[PDB]
């Protein structure tokens, strides 16, 4: 398992986007699913996914992971996507628009269908709910209110769910990182989504060819937001995960270990590589390295240092 | 002067978008021009503004201000605006795209023409340069390198500029606030652009009516970034300004004052109103109100508190 020579234990989980992916996740040592993307259930179809179709998908993954935690992220879709049954409005900047949790709060019918399926799946294993695109504690409160509604609905129908199901949020909007202490009081965990956190924090559309060079997850700015979220989570006794691609990056492994990240979630094939690094760097050394990294000025300084750290393999 | 009874002074400046705006600024008691928007020189024309046209504009504002500091912001335009001669690319998210300083560093011929006019204008008064849409220190250093190249050009041409000319940045990308301590080593001042800082920090397009209830400049997240910038500037002996619309908002005046903001730049008409608030609130009391505002969790609590604070003045 991923434990430093001096005894610091971390959890390595897998990001998946379909029911099939569980096989590779376990074969590569995944202790759980830190990010189950549910977009496969909504894309390339002409009507919304029914509760039962969603339930069967969630159920199969939850059972095949054999009690390991499965963090299911609710729909993270906006008008930038091709969905004919949705009818999205015209948006000049879709990435800053009506999408994901914002759409769900305005379309409770979609949101409750997915929550009902996830909750019913939690009766068969270890399930966690994760909201995307959270900007403020007020949104989490509204989301959790509809979640309690669905619980009450299933209660009235005689349908079982895990009453202790944990609910967390993707931390991908900068306001969520800067107010992590506030959010920490309302959620059971954070998962740092560095992919979009980098895009919003630097104001850089990764899909834009002309400013690609400005997209730098390994930047002083994002690593300071990472530390912000981890510390706020720990101060409230909650655990901090990361499902962005940084968690699978060997150059970031030692920094994240040093910052006290509880859970690395990544593409399954990256798990053995990160595990090896964790097992070959003391937690006390990693803390020093993360401390140096967070006092650096430019992403290049950090890259060179970590390259030298990985070089010492 | 805008000074609290117990002796805390702040500088009240004016935002302007044309040359003629300077008269109103002086008439309202502006101690400077905290933001000279230069978009008027680029918009609604068929060709780039020449150095001499820009120079004559900058020079007149600088002279009429009579030695008061004039902060001139370089071009802040992207493909969201219609400018045929710029040949902007089609972009999915223009606000996250190739604009302002990112364009200037890719098109230094445009950048140097404007910097040349600004530098020449500084021979006639108190001029300061401000870069928009800075996301990293790497960008500031790339922009300053071009500035020094322009200084060397003027030198060998025998043209005069203020060799002590101060250079600062707009703080509107979240990463710039999170790395203020790093940026403070490379700039002479910050100016907080709360308008765009709010949209980026919350990942909300203010122009999106469907989610415009999420646009909240007076949220904990934004005010915490403001404090971040102010503290970082002061640790390096620099001053922190705000030209975003928050600086002209009477509700924010006491918080901004309490956080230690050095300079309030606003539409000239708003200067007397903010001045009256500053002079009728004790700095010691303002610090406590700011501390409370930053410990709060919703934009509702803060605005509700501030409304009472400035009714009781």
UniProtKB/TrEMBL annotation, chains A, B:
Enzymatic class: transferase
An example molecular function term from Gene Ontology annotations: phosphoenolpyruvate-protein phosphotransferase activity
Sequence ranges assigned to domain PEP-utilising enzyme C-terminal in this UniProt record: 2-282
Residues annotated for Mg(2+) binding in this entry: 172, 196
Catalytic residues as annotated in Swiss-Prot or TrEMBL: 243
Cofactor names: Mg(2+)
Cellular component GO terms, alphabetical: cytoplasm
Residue numbers binding Mg(2+) 2: 172, 196
Annotated pyruvate binding sites: 73, 195-196
EC identifiers of the protein: 2.7.3.9
Binding of Mg(2+) 1, residues: 76, 172, 196
Keyword Transferase: yes
Family: Belongs to the PEP-utilizing enzyme family.
Protein name per its UniProtKB record: Phosphoenolpyruvate-protein phosphotransferase
Full protein stretch here: 261 to 572 of 573
